[PDB]
Amino acid sequence: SVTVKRIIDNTVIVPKLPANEDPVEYPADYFRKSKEIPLYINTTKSLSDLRGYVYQGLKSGNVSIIHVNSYLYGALKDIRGKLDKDWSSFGINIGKAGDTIGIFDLVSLKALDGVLPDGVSDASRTSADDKWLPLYLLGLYRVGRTQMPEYRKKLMDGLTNQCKMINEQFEPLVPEGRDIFDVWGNDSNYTKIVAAVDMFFHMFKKHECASFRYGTIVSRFKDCAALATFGHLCKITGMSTEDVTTWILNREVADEMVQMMLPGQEIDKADSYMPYLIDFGLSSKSPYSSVKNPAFHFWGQLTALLLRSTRARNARQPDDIEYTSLTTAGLLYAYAVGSSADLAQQFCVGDNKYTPDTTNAPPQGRDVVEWLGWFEDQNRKPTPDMMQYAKRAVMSLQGLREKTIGKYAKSEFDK
Amino acid sequence: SVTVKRIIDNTVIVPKLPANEDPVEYPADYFRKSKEIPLYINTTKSLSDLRGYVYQGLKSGNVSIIHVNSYLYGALKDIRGKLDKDWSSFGINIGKAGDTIGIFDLVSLKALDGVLPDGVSDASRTSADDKWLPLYLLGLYRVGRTQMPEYRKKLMDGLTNQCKMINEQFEPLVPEGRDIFDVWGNDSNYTKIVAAVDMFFHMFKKHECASFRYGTIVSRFKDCAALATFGHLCKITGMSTEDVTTWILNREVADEMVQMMLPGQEIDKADSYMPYLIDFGLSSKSPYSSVKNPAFHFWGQLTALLLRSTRARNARQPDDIEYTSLTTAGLLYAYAVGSSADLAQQFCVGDNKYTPDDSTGGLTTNAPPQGRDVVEWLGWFEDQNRKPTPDMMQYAKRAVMSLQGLREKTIGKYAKSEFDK
Amino acid sequence: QEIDKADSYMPYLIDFGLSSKSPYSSVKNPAFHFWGQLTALLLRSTRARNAR
RNA sequence: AAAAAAAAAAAAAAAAAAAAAAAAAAAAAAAAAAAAAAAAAAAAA
Predict the structure, then answer these.
(1) Which fold has domain A221-414?
(2) Nearest CA-CA distance, residue A260 and chain C, Å
(3) What family does this chain come from, according to its entry (chain A)?
(4) Do residues A40 and A291 lie in contact, with contact meaning Cβ atoms separated by under 8 Å?
(5) Which nucleotide is nearest to B286 (CA to C1')?
(6) Count of H helices and E strands in chain B?
(7) Beta bridge partners of A89
(8) Contact, B219 vs B274, CB < 8 A?
(9) CA distance B80 to A308
């Protein structure tokens, strides 16, 4: 099939179609360029000052990102945090035995010239400062990324978090529109700050100010949905990462799995940079994204859904994937895991179930090959019970959002 | 399966995935550091005073936790309480024979410098003091932890409790939001106080002021839900702790059970510190929590639910657990316990049911097992091609149909959907 | 014609006025457009649902 | 009389799409919208 030809007149034709570039970009394969995550923050000038440029700047539609940036640098040099262990990543040392370090031993710079208010926007603001203001500011990263009454859900609670040994009201005017400060997202250095705040308090989980991760948290594995629906599939099938992996039954799902699992990227690593590849700008097209792993994302979720997952219910149904092979392979894996439970006596009193005491009855366990065999044995077309299993998984599901694998499954199966 | 490889091009791949730290932390394995539960209470200055700093501080959005803390220390030195028995825990002596002791023989300190009002908030408040004000204050720990019209339920009654023998009325303004004083929770020393008040009155259950446990009670086994749904499963299957244990049929449920049952932690102990591991800060990630025991929590409740438990109805359905093996193993245990009751003559008059009659019969086959032995049932289940039977799934659908008012994301709502249709 | 080409002019044949009747259009490829979408639709396509 | 898509200028074609996205998932701790104790027919001269 490298070479197609029309039959009646017997002329060639080259079916070609619009290319589709943007390769992925891995964390590691970027520290092969630079060894530092440059955080340009400019006005290393007064903090007492900057604290004001932002309190006032926020109670109105205009506060410069460049200012909030610099404000955060100011509030966040709680050089607190004693590395009880070591800490490196991708070559980058960060601190060895017990070394005392702060949120920014992740390589600071300083940039350009333009900055708004003069000397003092107002003397009002005391150091009811770090206490919350940064929290609140970082928390707007989280709010900015969203779109439905979750925005007001997210703000309204990402605003009872500054009522924590503070007390207060709530600032800035317009609800949302992904517009009011949803631009901070677009700011290379802002993202770098939240990414650092999280990566830091992620490490020093017990810190007093660790409460700050409230908004800074949606940064960890930002754009790594498929990576995370992998881990969820595993957890929801109770199966091991490797055994789940064998259950991948489509070239372009395995292609993506291969792309995700690429080594020396610190995926699995305790406290690595990788989770923040996107916000630290180590990558501008993450290889763990739903969108670069559409087939994997669909399958893994559809499967988990069938296996009673609450999450998957609402996972988006990626477009331009082969739906009618991904679902089949999902159904099967779901069926396998589903029908044939994992029951096994765990405790006893000298007495336990030594277990080694029909035609076409589904396979004993969860071996891919046992099941593939069984399926081929099924003329390669999903069986009545399994399709019933599927219809039992999805009927009774209500409140399904359009274009989710949830709504997909229910339509594919309940009728 | 340590080593996976792609087939067509035959290259390796290492399926790895984001790690997941926060280990648990046990009570015991903390007194291997310190032998004291340090209650930093700073302003050991006047009480008549502090009683005011809080009465007024509360009738308004601003009262310092540091103040309530110190106020409680003041009101709660009812050094009352005669240890009729002994009393130790984790090495810590607390009082031997006849020893007379009070709520704070649990190791007090004193801290920093900042404190709000000057000399006198207002001379108003008499010693209509301990009588309730502490109760009320402690009661707000309980209220703070919550989220639905239970808040107003909980306050509205955790406020007819100060109308007791004292008859003194309701206070601050805003309903809730987990915000108004729901921050006292975050206070290391506050929690330590309520934890001590409970642990104490828990011991001296008959004390006059024991009425104080009203709010201080949600502290005992705070973050130990799986531990408690274990006990409930037991109670609800009438089975013994050990026989219930054998009925655990999933690696990760047993792993959790093992983690829970870890010895020398005083779980089972009369009046131990363990129940308060969280609030005394003996632990910052309790090993008895629903969340560190997700599979155990699910199973145990789902099962209990099936066995008619009223509680389980509303237990949350933990995420990222294997739902379709936990339910199977739950259904099975439920079925076992359910179908085959526990009937046996208990009393008589010289005449009783000798039960071993020549047990030869007709249902010569596949009828579910006589009793509740795991192995008898496992066998039977394997005998069932390892797929839950019609009656047992009917038993399940009888358990859950007719259940109404099920909350979303509870094992209740789960079971009804899994079974009623 | 550089259809498949990375960054070619072809995608803009219309707007660059390189063409005033594009050979890739639904309208000059009515049968192909129908078939391909109808098919895709059957194969669960979300897009095709709304193709004219 | 003349007519006959309440067709149509073309060009057109997802009431698709900036990029990045992807549970309208999440500080963490939790987890019966259980629970002072005592009780518990919203039973009773």
Answers:
(1) Rhabdovirus nucleoprotein-like (1.10.3610)
(2) 25
(3) Belongs to the vesiculovirus nucleocapsid protein family.
(4) no
(5) D29
(6) 14, 4
(7) A92
(8) no
(9) 55
What would the two tokens of residue B186 be? 């975050």
Across the interface, of C3, C44, C45, the residue whose CB is closest to A18 is C3
Cβ within 8 Å, pair A258-B386: no
Contact by Cβ (8 Å): A276, A222:
yes
A307 near B323, Cβ under 8 Å? yes
B386 to A396: CB separation less than 8 angstroms, yes or no: no
- Report d(CA A211, CA A192) in Å as an integer: 18
CATH number of B221-420, picked from 1.10.3610.10, 3.40.50.2300, 3.30.565.10, 1.10.4160.10: 1.10.3610.10
Distance B58 CA to D13 C1' (A): 67
CA-nearest residue to A367 within chain B is: B1
Residue C7 Cα, gap to closest chain A Cα (Å): 9
CA-to-CA dists, residue B252 to B292, B319, B322, angstroms: 11, 14, 9
Model resolution, angstroms: 3.0
CA dihedral A83, A87, A93, A96 (to 10 degrees): 50
Contacts of B317 in chain A (CB under 8 A): 310
Residues 6+ apart with CB under 8 A from C32: none
Instruction: Flag whether residue A199 sits within 8 Å of chain B, measured between CB atoms.
Output: no
Place of tokens 């929690």: B191
Which pair of tokens denotes residue B190? Answer: 């506050």
- Selected for mutation to probe chain C from A13, A14, A16 (highest C CB count within 10 Å) is A16
CATH number for the region B36-218 comes to: 1.10.3570.10
Whether residue A403 and residue C44 make contact (CB cut-off 8 A), yes or no, is no
Q: DSSP 3-state assignment of B13?
A: strand
Gap between the Cα atoms of A233 and A215, Å rounded: 26
Method: X-ray
C3–A17 CB contact, under 8 Å:
yes
Task: Measure Cα distances from A278 to A196, A264, B241, C36, C46 in Å.
Answer: 12, 17, 50, 37, 29
A211 DSSP 8-state letter: G
Which of A263, A337, A396 is facing B417, going by the closest CB pair?
A: A396
Contact map slice: B 98-117 vs A, CB within 8 A:
none
- Integer Cα distance of B133 and B214 in angstroms: 12
Angstrom CA distances, B185 to A76, B145, B192, stand at 25, 7, 10
Distance from CA of A198 to the nearest CA of B (A): 15
Phi then psi dihedrals of residue B5, to 5 deg: -145, 150
| Same fold: A36-218 with A221-414 | no
- Residue A290: is it exposed, middle or buried by C-beta count within 10 angstroms (0-12/13-18/19+)? buried
Does residue A13 belong to the interface with chain C, where contact is any CB pair within 8 Å? no
Domain boundaries along the sequence of chain A: 36-218, 221-414
Quote the DSSP letter at residue B118: -
- Cα separations in angstroms, B91 against A139, B27, B106, B276: 45, 12, 13, 16
